[PDB]
Nucleic acid binder design. Structure first.
Length: 50
DNA sequence: TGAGAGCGGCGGAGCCAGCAGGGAGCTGGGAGC
RNA sequence: AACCGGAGAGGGAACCCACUC
DNA sequence: GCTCCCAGCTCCCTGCTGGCTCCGAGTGGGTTCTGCCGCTCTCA
């Protein structure tokens, strides 16, 4: 991407569906999104149990 | 006194205790008589 | 011609990997 | 000699910095590891 690109494609918006598949940039961004939830699942338990 | 051997020794957050600095308040030395 | 069974040992520390959430 | 007002000492207070304890529940495997050098006394 060009420097200082605030457009939807350049910041994480995925305009494709899971039926049409994702472009490589959208695939990486989607991985970045899923990683956050996966981390919170492990972090949350240590607080809730305490 | 030499081999066998016994052992002698060489990360982060958040509550509690101490310290430092700063005033109100009391008592001796001087101000008037 | 003459009795003829029978057990008992494995423990701890540390580390890593993995699983279910 | 008399009462009294102003600085020096006593107290408490506030504020700040250093020190101790906690950090989900289960489960299954495997692997390594439990000290070592030598120094003096004894049997031969």
């Amino acid at each position: 991407f060009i420097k200082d690109d605030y457009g939807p494609e350049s910041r994480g918006f995925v305009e494709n569906s899971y039926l049409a598949g994702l472009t490589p940039t959208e695939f990486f961004f989607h991985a970045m999104g899923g990683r956050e939830g996966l981390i919170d699942t492990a972090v949350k338990t240590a607080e809730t149990g305490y």
